[PDB]
């Protein structure tokens with residue numbers, strides 16, 4: 297009566313948000329889940345601790361979605377490394393992939409990015425694929441277009457990895473599915489910890505009212521967002537709000553990003569995963585040089601964290617006027633300017649090194665689309681995994697989620713469950729007969 301030991305260990309996103317990269321080890325098989333970069337770090341430190349292993353022993357690599365913290369390091373791993381296994385991702389994911397990293401570059405060069413394309417295989421949702429002795433398939437994760445939750449089976453043992461997911465339907469995205477096939481192990485995100493913020497209807501109303509308030513008092517409203525993802529949802533909301541308020545029809549809304557033309561084009565190519573994306577009050581803006589910053593307006597510009605680029609340029613030219621305002625709609629990662637601002641600093645530092653007073657208003661209305669405790673608990677209750685591994689949340693939020701889940705099952709339902717809280721590099725060991 298033998299027993300096989302399964303090993304799970306994060307090289308990134310272990311007790312943190314950023315650079316997701318988790319290694320699975322079972323019966324001679326080695327799997328890597330995601331391969332992104334930490335938005336709050338730079339250089340080689342923004343990468344996961346891949347040095348703890350050698351890329352030549354990794355049979356399979358699965359990427360959940362196109363966000364940089366999940367695939368930002370892929371080109372590097374596929375070119376400048378000794379990796380020779382197979383890599384898979386959703387069709388939409390790969391599509392939106394080539395157009396996201398490029399905008400990010402302007403680690404790896406646009407050449408390294410192209411040399412990657414051919415090393416990445418695609419997979420449809422609900423379709424079994426097999427590599428080495430590994431069977432895998434994916435379910436819709438909600439969150440962003442093409443996002444997936446990968447189920448993996450090896451020797452009868454099943455593990456579901458959620459990547460980032462949302463159980464609440466968007467204005468254009470479907471809610472994550474709850475698989476009927478029960479996993480032995482669940483690796484799940486913990487971004488929001490146990491925090492349960494306003495409902496969608498409330499968040500949208502507050503978002504519109506804040507934007508309205510800013511332009512009404514004569515200010516410019518800045519909304520940092522990466523080219524594709526949540527930005528598309530915000531645009532639908534704004535265009536619709538403007539349509540219902542003609543007094544705003546003379547106030548321009550701009551969608552600014554490099555190649556924003558293909559961003560919408562390629563994005564609509566996958567309507568499968570009236571055309572609302574035919575905006576009547578929004579226009580594309582290529583860069584600061586094509587912008588006549590004349591009067592009040594609203595500008596949605598990347599990068600989402602204002603670490604640099606246009607959103608940062610705009611913020612720097614607008615932060616000293618009380619009439620202006622910025623709305624942060626995404627999860628703020630440590631080390632990020634967007635995160636810092638929300639501290640109410642008296643002044644900020646220009647990329648040049650200048651010091652400017654922060655007078656423009658700063659509002660945080662989250663549209664990052666991650667599950668919350670209620671969704672996560674319901675998710676876990678339906679799947680009933682004996683083992684749960686948390687992997688994409690700040691230390692304290694993750695700790696709170698873990699204690700809440702343990703309390704819910706051990707104390708309340710008086711049922712046995714095991715929740716793991718691995719730090720980067722820390723391994724989790726499980727034995728299957």
Ligand SMILES: [Zn+2]
Pocket residue numbers: 361363439460
């Ligand atoms: Zn994400």
Ligand SMILES: [Zn+2]
Pocket residue numbers: 314363365366460688
């Ligand atoms: Zn993420």
Ligand SMILES: [Zn+2]
Pocket residue numbers: 540541542543
């Ligand atoms: Zn009105």
Ligand SMILES: [Zn+2]
Pocket residue numbers: 706711712713
């Ligand atoms: Zn127990």
